[PDB]
């Protein structure tokens, strides 16, 4: 099955843009990556660096996670990201987000070794 970095790296990245250029972004990114085939999924983050520049994160300013775990870490610098999280529309199997741009510090948690992330805390 899937390994935790390998969905993350579907979920959460998306180093083929250096951010959102239209307020479809969300619409077409949660469909392609599959983020909505079973059921809307509320809220999601992507990722507009380098694969290795969100990797080398867990090697950053480890912090706790929101649900208290220990391995979660803070970038040091901010990153382009988009958030998407669900339209008042929004409504199985034509899910529907807003798009929305910003330059934020990322919180991931790492496992592995290699130590990679495993799942999007937060944007901050």
């Not at 988009?82 to 339209?87: G, L």
């Not at 199997?93 to 910003?102: E, G, H, I, L, M």
Request: glycine fraction near 2%.
């Amino acid at each position: 099955k899937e390994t935790a970095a390998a969905k993350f790296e579907r979920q959460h990245m998306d180093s083929s843009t250096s951010a959102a250029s239209s307020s479809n972004y969300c619409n077409q990114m949660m469909k392609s990556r599959n983020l909505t085939k079973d059921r809307c999924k509320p809220v999601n983050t992507f990722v507009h660096e380098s694969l290795a520049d969100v990797q080398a994160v867990c090697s950053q300013k480890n912090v706790a996670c929101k649900n208290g775990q220990t391995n979660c870490y803070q970038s040091y610098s901010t990153m382009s990201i988009t958030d998407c999280r669900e339209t008042g529309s929004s409504k199985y199997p034509n899910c529907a987000y807003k798009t929305t741009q910003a330059n934020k510090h990322i919180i991931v948690a790492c496992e592995g070794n290699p130590y990679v992330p495993v799942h999007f805390d937060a944007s901050v």
